[PDB]
From Swiss-Prot, chain A:
There is a cross-link at K28, K125 (Glycyl lysine isopeptide (Lys-Gly) (interchain with G-Cter in ubiquitin)). The lineage of its organism: Eukaryota, Fungi, Dikarya, Ascomycota, Saccharomycotina. Belongs to the universal ribosomal protein uL3 family. Component of the large ribosomal subunit (LSU). Mature yeast ribosomes consist of a small (40S) and a large (60S) subunit. The 40S small subunit contains 1 molecule of ribosomal RNA (18S rRNA) and 33 different proteins (encoded by 57 genes). The large 60S subunit contains 3 rRNA molecules (25S, 5.8S and 5S rRNA) and 46 different proteins (encoded by 81 genes). uL3 forms together with ES39L one of the contact sites for the signal recognition particle that targets ribosomes to the endoplasmic reticulum membrane. Pfam families: Ribosomal_L3. The modification Phosphothreonine is found at T92. Keywords: Cytoplasm, Isopeptide bond, Methylation, Phosphoprotein, Ribonucleoprotein, Ribosomal protein, Ubl conjugation. Disruption phenotype: A mutant confers resistance to trichodermin, a trichotecene toxin produced by plant-pathogenic fungi. The gene is RPL3. Present with 450 molecules/cell in log phase SD medium. One of its GO terms (molecular function) is RNA binding. InterPro entries: L3_arc_euk (IPR045077), Ribosomal_L3_dom_3_arc_sf (IPR044892), Ribosomal_uL3 (IPR000597), Ribosomal_uL3_CS (IPR019926), Transl_B-barrel_sf (IPR009000). This is Large ribosomal subunit protein uL3.
From Swiss-Prot, chain B:
Phosphorylation at Ser-174 and Ser-175 promotes nuclear export. Belongs to the eIF-6 family. Present with 18600 molecules/cell in log phase SD medium. This is Eukaryotic translation initiation factor 6. The lineage of its organism: Eukaryota, Fungi, Dikarya, Ascomycota, Saccharomycotina. The modification Phosphoserine is found at S174, S175. It is found in: Cytoplasm; Nucleus, Nucleolus.
From Swiss-Prot, chain C:
Keywords: Acetylation, Cytoplasm, Methylation, Ribonucleoprotein, Ribosomal protein. The keyword Acetylation applies. HAMAP family: Ribosomal_uL14 (MF_01367). There are 2 genes for uL14 in yeast. Component of the large ribosomal subunit (LSU). Mature yeast ribosomes consist of a small (40S) and a large (60S) subunit. The 40S small subunit contains 1 molecule of ribosomal RNA (18S rRNA) and 33 different proteins (encoded by 57 genes). The large 60S subunit contains 3 rRNA molecules (25S, 5.8S and 5S rRNA) and 46 different proteins (encoded by 81 genes). It is found in: Cytoplasm. It comes from Saccharomyces cerevisiae (strain ATCC 204508 / S288c) (Baker's yeast). The lineage of its organism: Eukaryota, Fungi, Dikarya, Ascomycota, Saccharomycotina. This is Large ribosomal subunit protein uL14A. Component of the ribosome, a large ribonucleoprotein complex responsible for the synthesis of proteins in the cell. The small ribosomal subunit (SSU) binds messenger RNAs (mRNAs) and translates the encoded message by selecting cognate aminoacyl-transfer RNA (tRNA) molecules. The large subunit (LSU) contains the ribosomal catalytic site termed the peptidyl transferase center (PTC), which catalyzes the formation of peptide bonds, thereby polymerizing the amino acids delivered by tRNAs into a polypeptide chain. Gene3D superfamilies: Ribosomal protein L14.
From Swiss-Prot, chain D:
GO terms for cellular component: cytoplasm; nucleolus; preribosome, large subunit precursor. Belongs to the eukaryotic ribosomal protein eL24 family. It comes from the Eukaryota. One of its GO terms (biological process) is ribosomal large subunit biogenesis. This is Ribosome biogenesis protein RLP24. GO terms for molecular function: ATPase activator activity; ATPase binding; structural constituent of ribosome. Associated with nucleolar and cytoplasmic pre-60S particles. At the end of biogenesis it dissociates from cytoplasmic pre-60S particles and is likely to be exchanged for its ribosomal homolog, RPL24. Interacts (via C-terminus) with AFG2 (hexameric form); the interaction is direct, recruits AFG2 to pre-60S ribosomal particles and promotes AFG2 ATPase activity and RLP24 release from pre-60S ribosomal particles. Interacts with NOG1; the interaction is direct.
Length: 333, 225, 126, 116
RNA sequence: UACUGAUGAAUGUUACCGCAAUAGUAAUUGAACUUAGUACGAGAGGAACAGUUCAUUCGGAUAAUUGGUUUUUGCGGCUGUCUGAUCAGGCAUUGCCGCGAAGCUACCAUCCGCUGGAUUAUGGCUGAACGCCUCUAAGUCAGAAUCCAUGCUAGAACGCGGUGAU
RNA sequence: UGUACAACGGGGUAUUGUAAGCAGUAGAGUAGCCUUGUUGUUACGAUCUGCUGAGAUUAAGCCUUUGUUGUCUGAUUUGU
C-alpha cells in the first residue's frame, strides 16, 4: 500500500495533535488559527451549484456532508515558545486562575478519590496585584517568537457523558507578540464562539483519529481542503431552515443522530466526510495558506437540509409531518 | 441574414437551441458565444432566454412552440417553468404537458399556423396544441421516418426536409402546409435537418459545416433576400 | 460519473431500426487498466461490439456501439437513483451519426447530454 | 425540487431517497424505499395491501374526496411571481393543513363510532 | 539473528501540556470543456500557454448506501422425533427455507491525496584572459517530474522544557 | 453521597410478517344420519374476519429516561 503512512501503528491519544500551524500575516490583528469539536452524523444536502463553466452549472446537486458539533470553547491559559537551534522550546506557560471543574478533571486519572487540589497554591500566587503573574507575562512579552493559547471543551454543553475537557494548543497569526499576549490577557476565562473563527464558504482542514477495527485502524489522519457549508447557532431556532425551505426545524434528525444526541449548541457543516467516527474529537485548522482556486471561490446557496430519521428510514422531516400524513391514531384519541 | 456559428464545437444547433418569431431558447453552458450569436442577430427586439429543460443543455429538440405558445414535457422542473414565465410576455402562453414521450422537438414540427405531429401520440395533446398555439394539427410522417421534427425544418416562408423524400411526398405534404418544400442537406451532407439548423421567417442560423451549396438551397426556399 | 453495469462479454439488445437484434460486447473504449479485472461499461459509453443475431449485411463486422439502456442502479445528481428494464445499446459510426432512423424504448439522460445526434434520433427519453 | 408521491405508498418521496424505475413503455415508477420496490417486483396489487394509502382511499379508511384535497392539484399554468402572492400562500398552506387534519379527525370520529 | 510490533527498571516522586535531534516519506497518467476551427497552410489538415471539469492506477481514510456475510444462532413457515391431545418446541455433530439489525469485511462502495528555495542540461547579462570577440576565469539572471526544505508519519525508551500536586 | 453509578421499569427505534387462543352464523364439501335444517347435529372444513401493521427480538456493541431498587472503599507502593 502507501509506504508514507508508516509505521502504521496506534495513535497516542483520542485527541490527536496538529503537527503544523498556518504561517503568519503580521499586518493583521490577533486571530486564532484552529478550533475543536466532536464529529456527529452524516446528513444529506441538495443545493443549486453556482460553479461557472461546469457540466452541472446552475443545476441541483446532491452530496453527503457531516455535522461536527462545536461548543463555545473557553481559554484557560497562554504559552510562549522561543526559537532555538534545536527547534522550538516552551520557556513559560501561564494560567487563568479560575478554572472549570472540567479542566481540573483532566489533571486526574481518578477524580472521585482525589481531594480536588488542582490549582490551589497557584491561585494563591495570583492573589495580589500581579507581581509573579505579570512577570511571566512580561517574560513572554520579551522573548518567544510564537505564542500559543491553552483552551478546553465545554463538555457539559455536549450531550456526551465523557465529562473530561480536552486541552489543546492554538497559536496566533496576528503579528506583534505584544498584541498576542495582551489579547490573551483580555481573553482569560472567556468563552470563544464558533462563528468567531470560521465562516461559510471557507476551505478548511480537519484532524482526527480514524475508526479502529482490529493492527488496522486507529491512526491520526489529516485530510485537507473541505468547504464549510453552514456555521450554525444553537440559540437560533430553525437551523434546518434555509432561505428556500424556511420550515422551523433543527438540523438534528427525529430522535437525535445515530449514536449521538440533540444539538443544543453551535455546529459546523463540513463538505464530504471528516476522518474518525461519531463521539470522536476533531480539530479544524484553517488551510495553512491562501488556497485560491474556483473550488474555493464559490459562495454556496443551501437549498434544503435533510433531517429524516437516519435510524432506519425516513419519509418525513419533522414530527409535525408524521401526524399530518398519518392523521390521528389510537393512543392519541 | 443566414448566420453560421457553433455551440461547444458541435454542428447540431437545433439540438441546443429553439427559435421562434417572438423568442429564442438557449442552453446555459460555459460558452457565451452561442448566446452572443443570437444576441448579434436579434438584439433587444425579441427576448432570448437562458434556461434548461429537466436540467439538460439539450433544449431545442425537447420543446415545442410558436408566436402564440410554448409546450414543455413532463420532466420539466418547476423552477425552469417559473423562470420561463418570468422571461416571456403575455403574447406567448406556456404549458407543461403530462405525456409518455419527452422529445417534443422530435415530434412537433410547427410554425404560427400549421403543426405536424407523431401518429402514435395521445388525443389530449392534439386537443391542446390547436388551442394554445392557435394552429392546425396533423398526424403525418415523411418518407418512412417516424420522427418529423428531427427530419424537417419549418417556417411560414418555406420548408426543408431530408434528401431521401420522394417526389410524391413532396407535392402532397406541401399542399397540406400551403408552402413549397425542398429535400436538401445541412452541415456537409446530414439527414437530420431540424436538429442541424434553426429557422423562422427572417433568420436562419446554421452550424459551421453548412457549405455554400447548402446555404444557397436554404436561402432559396426560406427566401431571406 | 455514473455506475458501471455492462461487462466485457455481455449480450446487450438492439434499440434502433437498423436490422440487428443484439450486440456482444468484445472491448471497451476509454477504459481503466486494473489488475485481474476486465473493464466495465456504463450508459452513453462507446464499446466495440459484434452482431450475434442480425442480417448478413450488419453481421461479420466489428464496430463501435453507444449504450442507451443500462439496467444497473446508477446515480443522478438530482437525488434519486434509477435503472432501466434491460441491457441494451445502439450502433453508430465514430462520428456519432445513427444508422437507424428511430430508436424504440427509453434513452438515458446522461447519454442524451453527451451525444447530440442520439438526442436527435430519440423517440422517447426517460 | 419536487416532492413526489410513491407509486406504491403515495407517500412524500424526498431527494436522495428511494428508487425510480423506468419501464420500456416509459413512465415514472418512483418509490420511497426498497421494500415497496421489491413488492412491485413480485407483481402485487398496491390497493390490496392495507398499509399503503391506495387501500385507505378505496375502502374508505381515510377520506378520498374533500375540498382541501383538491387544492393539492398537480398545477400546470405558470405564474408571474408577485411578492405578496407568495406571501399569502405561506399562511394559506398552514391554514389548509389545519382544516385537512380537523376534517380527517371528524372522519375518524365517524369511523370510530359503532364501538359504543 | 535481522525484521514487524508490543511491555519495561532507571535518572526527587507523581501528573499534565509540549518542543524535535534523528529516521522514513508520495502520488501518477490520460481525456474533455473554453482558448479554435484562431495562429498556421494552395488546400488537406490543425496547435499551444492561460482558465476549468472528470477519469486511470497507486496510497490514506471511511460505512450513509451496495454486497460474501450471522452462532441477536432475531422472527415467520416446513420436517426427523414426541410428551394422553391442542399449547410448549424438549432435541436435530450449527436441521431445512423465507428475510434481518449488530458485526467480520470488500474497486463490490464514498471522501481525501501541498508550496518555497537551491540546481543540472540550456538560454542569457555584465566581461577578461588575448588593445577584437567570447554565458565565466572574478560576478550575476532565468530554468528539469531533480535536489532540499514546507507538509505528513514516528518521537531519542540514557535528548530537552514549562506547568499542577505535599 | 451526588442532574454519582449500576440493575430494572418506561419511551423512542428498527426486525420478522399477521401469534396461540377466543367470538363465530361465514367455509365447495360433507365420516355418518334424520322429523334433509331461509338454528342441521356429532368430529371437520383446503379458510375469512374482530383482537391482527398484531405477537415476538426490541441490544446481548441502539439511544433517551420526571419512575423503582441496589451501591459508594479494600490492599500495596512512592516523594535526593
Amino acid at each position: 500500500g502507501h509506504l508514507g503512512f508508516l509505521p502504521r501503528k496506534r495513535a497516542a491519544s483520542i485527541r490527536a495533535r496538529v503537527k503544523a500551524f498556518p504561517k503568519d500575516d503580521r499586518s493583521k490583528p490577533v486571530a486564532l488559527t484552529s478550533f475543536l469539536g466532536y464529529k456527529a452524523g452524516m446528513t444529506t444536502i441538495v443545493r443549486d451549484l453556482d460553479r461557472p463553466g461546469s457540466k452541472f452549472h446552475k443545476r441541483e446537486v446532491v452530496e453527503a456532508v457531516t455535522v461536527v458539533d462545536t461548543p463555545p470553547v473557553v481559554v484557560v491559559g497562554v504559552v510562549g515558545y522561543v526559537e532555538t537551534p534545536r527547534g522550538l522550546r516552551s520557556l513559560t506557560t501561564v494560567w487563568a486562575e479560575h478554572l472549570s471543574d472540567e479542566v481540573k478533571r483532566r489533571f486526574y486519572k481518578n477524580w472521585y478519590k482525589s481531594k480536588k487540589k488542582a490549582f490551589t497554591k497557584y491561585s494563591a500566587k495570583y492573589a495580589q496585584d500581579g507581581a509573579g503573574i505579570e512577570r511571566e507575562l512580561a517574560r513572554i512579552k520579551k522573548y518567544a517568537s510564537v505564542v500559543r493559547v491553552l483552551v478546553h471543551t465545554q463538555i457539559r454543553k455536549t450531550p456526551l457523558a465523557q465529562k473530561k475537557a480536552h486541552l489543546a494548543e492554538i497559536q496566533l497569526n496576528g503579528g506583534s507578540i505584544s498584541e498576542k499576549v495582551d489579547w490573551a490577557r483580555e481573553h482569560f476565562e472567556k468563552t470563544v464562539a464558533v462563528d468567531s473563527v470560521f465562516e461559510q464558504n471557507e476551505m478548511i482542514d480537519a484532524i482526527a483519529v480514524t475508526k479502529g477495527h482490529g493492527q488496522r485502524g486507529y491512526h491520526s489522519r489529516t485530510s485537507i481542503n473541505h468547504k464549510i457549508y453552514r456555521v450554525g447557532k444553537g440559540d437560533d431556532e430553525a437551523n434546518g431552515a434555509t432561505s428556500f425551505d424556511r420550515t422551523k426545524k433543527t438540523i438534528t434528525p427525529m430522535g437525535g443522530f445515530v449514536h449521538y444526541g440533540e444539538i443544543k449548541n453551535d455546529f459546523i457543516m463540513v463538505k464530504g466526510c471528516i476522518p474518525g467516527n461519531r463521539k470522536r474529537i476533531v480539530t479544524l485548522r484553517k488551510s495553512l495558506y491562501t488556497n485560491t482556486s474556483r473550488k474555493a471561490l464559490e459562495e454556496v446557496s443551501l437549498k434544503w437540509i435533510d433531517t429524516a430519521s437516519k435510524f432506519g428510514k425516513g419519509r418525513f422531516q419533522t414530527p409535525a409531518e408524521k401526524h399530518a400524513f398519518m392523521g390521528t391514531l389510537k393512543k392519541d384519541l | 441574414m443566414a448566420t453560421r456559428t457553433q455551440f461547444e464545437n458541435s454542428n447540431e444547433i437545433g439540438v441546443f437551441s429553439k427559435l421562434t418569431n417572438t423568442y429564442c431558447l438557449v442552453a446555459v453552458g460555459g460558452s457565451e458565444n452561442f448566446y452572443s450569436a443570437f444576441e448579434a442577430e436579434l438584439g433587444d427586439a425579441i427576448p432570448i432566454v437562458h434556461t434548461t429543460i429537466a436540467g439538460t443543455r439539450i433544449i431545442g429538440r425537447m420543446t415545442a412552440g410558436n408566436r402564440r405558445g410554448l409546450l414543455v414535457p413532463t420532466q420539466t422542473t418547476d423552477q425552469e417553468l417559473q423562470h420561463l414565465r418570468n422571461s416571456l410576455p403575455d403574447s406567448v402562453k406556456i404549458q407543461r404537458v403530462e405525456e409518455r414521450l419527452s422529445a417534443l422537438g422530435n415530434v412537433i414540427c410547427c410554425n404560427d399556423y400549421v403543426a405536424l405531429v407523431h401518429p402514435d401520440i395521445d388525443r389530449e395533446t392534439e386537443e391542446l396544441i390547436s388551442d394554445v398555439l392557435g394552429v392546425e394539427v396533423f398526424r403525418q410522417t415523411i418518407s418512412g421516418n417516424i420522427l418529423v421534427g428531427s427530419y424537417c425544418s419549418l417556417s411560414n416562408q418555406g420548408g426543408l426536409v431530408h434528401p431521401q423524400t420522394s417526389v410524391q411526398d413532396q407535392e402532397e405534404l406541401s399542399s397540406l402546409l400551403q408552402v413549397p418544400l425542398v429535400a436538401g442537406t445541412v452541415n456537409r451532407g446530414s439527414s437530420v435537418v431540424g436538429a442541424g439548423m434553426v429557422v423562422n421567417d427572417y433568420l436562419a442560423v446554421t452550424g459551421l459545416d453548412t457549405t455554400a451549396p447548402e446555404l444557397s438551397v436554404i436561402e432559396s426556399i426560406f427566401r431571406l433576400q | 460519473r455514473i455506475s458501471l453495469g455492462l461487462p466485457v462479454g455481455a449480450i446487450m439488445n438492439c434499440a434502433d431500426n437498423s436490422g440487428a437484434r443484439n450486440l456482444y460486447i468484445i472491448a471497451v473504449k476509454g477504459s481503466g487498466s486494473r489488475l485481474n479485472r476486465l473493464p466495465a461499461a456504463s450508459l452513453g459509453d462507446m464499446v466495440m461490439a459484434t452482431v450475434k443475431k442480425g442480417k448478413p449485411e450488419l453481421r461479420k463486422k466489428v464496430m463501435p456501439a453507444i449504450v442507451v439502456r443500462q439496467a444497473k442502479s446508477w446515480r443522478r445528481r438530482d437525488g434519486v437513483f434509477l435503472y432501466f428494464e434491460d441491457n441494451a445499446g445502439v450502433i453508430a459510426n465514430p462520428k456519432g451519426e445513427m444508422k437507424g432512423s428511430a430508436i424504440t424504448g427509453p434513452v438515458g439522460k446522461e447519454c442524451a447530454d453527451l451525444w447530440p445526434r442520439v438526442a436527435s434520433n430519440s423517440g422517447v427519453v426517460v | 425540487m419536487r416532492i413526489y408521491q410513491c407509486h406504491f405508498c403515495s407517500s412524500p418521496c424526498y431527494p436522495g431517497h428511494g428508487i425510480m424505475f423506468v419501464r420500456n413503455d416509459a413512465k415514472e415508477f418512483r418509490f420511497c424505499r426498497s421494500k415497496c420496490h421489491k413488492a412491485f417486483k413480485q407483481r402485487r396489487n398496491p390497493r390490496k395491501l392495507k398499509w399503503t394509502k391506495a387501500f385507505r382511499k378505496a375502502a374508505g379508511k381515510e377520506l378520498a374526496v374533500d375540498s382541501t384535497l383538491t387544492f393539492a392539484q398537480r398545477r400546470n399554468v405558470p405564474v408571474r411571481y408577485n411578492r405578496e402572492l407568495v406571501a399569502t400562500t405561506l399562511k394559506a398552506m398552514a391554514r389548509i393543513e389545519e382544516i385537512r387534519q380537523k376534517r380527517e379527525r371528524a372522519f375518524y370520529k365517524n369511523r370510530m363510532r359503532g364501538n359504543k
